[PDB]
Amino acid sequence: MKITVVDLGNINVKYVGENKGRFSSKITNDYQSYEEGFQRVEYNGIKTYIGVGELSREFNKADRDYMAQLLYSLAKANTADTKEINLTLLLPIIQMKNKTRLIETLKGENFKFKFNGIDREIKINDLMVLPEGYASYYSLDIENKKGDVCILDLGSRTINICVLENAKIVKTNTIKLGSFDFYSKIKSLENAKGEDYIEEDIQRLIDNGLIKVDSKQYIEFLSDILNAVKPYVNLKTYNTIFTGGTSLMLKEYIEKLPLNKFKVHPNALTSNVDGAMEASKKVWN
């Protein structure tokens, strides 16, 4: 029957199915008087509002109340008439060792919710769990997988690397660095200029032209990440597919790099689960 794919992401939860899209992993459970003015869900004795509050930073999100965001994203991907669906969840690569913990709350059960009053329940056909970032592989045709590839997801705080040969994997790694670190570095001196910004509001300010982050600072970040990744891979080799939002930060200068074969694929942020959807096709079809 019908299938959906869900990416829990590093800062944004995201979904594809009969309904497709994304939203921030942002969450709150604090004081309230105007519930109607916020996206909200109450279930399992927990009340939450979605897309606002605190973003959190603790490792292994699977252990700190991910459930509300997960079910909210499921409701988004689904329509009110959905009977039952298959599940292809995704986790940050180095974290899938926690899948069993997820299996505690997830494996082949049925779930109830309210989410503003739509408030129905649904069972899941089956369960698969995959690495975040990696799935990009299956969105690719043989157009470039005819040669060796490197899926490279520039996640908010991380870079997720998996180098693959014919049909198969060759190596994997994670580096704890990301555009959030760049925002922190920028604020280390921009806040010092009599301001009260944060790593969360910053991007909107670069968008509106209120702030003038220098062009060469993005280049500094690019060089830093390249230096970090050198010991494992040759970027010139292993044609690299950039994915994630940070690739959307840096496309304009990634394109300027002297590398041999590479690209920032369209919807690079959602390319991983474009590939996960192709992998789902492979699984069922």
Ligand X SMILES: Nc1nc2c(ncn2[C@@H]2O[C@H](COP(=O)(O)OP(=O)(O)OP(=O)(O)O)[C@@H](O)[C@H]2O)c(=O)[nH]1
Residue 143 binds its own copies, judged by CB under 8 A = no
Q: According to the binding rule CB under 8 A, does residue 57 interact with its own copies?
A: yes
User: Contact positions toward ligand X, by CB under 6 A?
Assistant: 9-12, 25, 154-156, 178-179, 203, 244-246, 248-249, 269
β partners of residue 168: 165
**Partner touching 204 among its own copies, ligand X, none, CB below 5 to 8 Å by kind:** its own copies
* Interacting span for its own copies (CB under 8 A) from 27-35, 78-86, 115-123, 152-160: 27-35
Binds 245, which of ligand X, its own copies, none (CB < 5 to 8 A, cut-off by type)? Answer: ligand X
What is the contact mask toward its own copies in residues 245 to 284, using x (rule: CB under 8 A)? ---------------x------------------------
Of 125 and 191, CB closest to its own copies: 191
Q: Does 216 bind its own copies (CB under 8 A)?
A: no
Task: For its own copies, give the closer residue by CB, 176 or 216.
Answer: 176
Shortest distance, position 1 Cβ to ligand X, whole Å:
27
CB 270 within 8 A of CB 130: no
Could you say whether residue 234 binds its own copies (CB under 8 A)?
Answer: yes
From the list its own copies, ligand X, none, partner contacted by residue 244 (C-beta under 5 to 8 A by kind): ligand X
* The binder of its own copies chosen from 1, 58, 143, 192 (CB under 8 A): 58
- Work out whether 97 is an interface residue with its own copies (CB under 8 A): yes
How many binding residues for its own copies (CB under 8 A)?
42
Structure tokens belonging to residue 285: 């079809």
| 142 scored as a contact of its own copies (CB under 8 A) | no
3-state SS, the chain, equals CCEEEEECCCCEEEEECCCCEEEECCEECCCCCCHHHCCEEEECCEEEEECCCECCCCCCHHHCCCHHHHHHHHHHHCCCCCCEEEEEEEECHHHHHHHHHHHHHHCCCEEECCHHHCCCEEEEEEEEEEECCCCHHHHCCHHHHCCCEEEEECCCCCEEEEEEECCEEEEEEEECCCHHHHHHHHHHHHCCCCCCCCCCCHHHHHHHCCCCCCHHHHHHHHHHHHHHHCCCCCCCCCEEEEECHHHHHHHHHHCCCCCCCEEECCCHHHHHHHHHHHHHHHHHC
Maximum CA pair distance of the chain? 58
Task: Establish if 93 lies at the interface with its own copies (CB under 8 A).
Answer: yes
Q: What phi, psi does 127 have (nearest 5°)?
A: -135, 125
Which positions lie near its own copies, rule CB under 8 A? 29-31, 33-34, 37-38, 45, 52, 57-59, 63, 93-97, 131, 147-148, 165, 169-172, 176, 185, 195-197, 201, 204-205, 208, 210, 230-231, 234, 236-237, 260
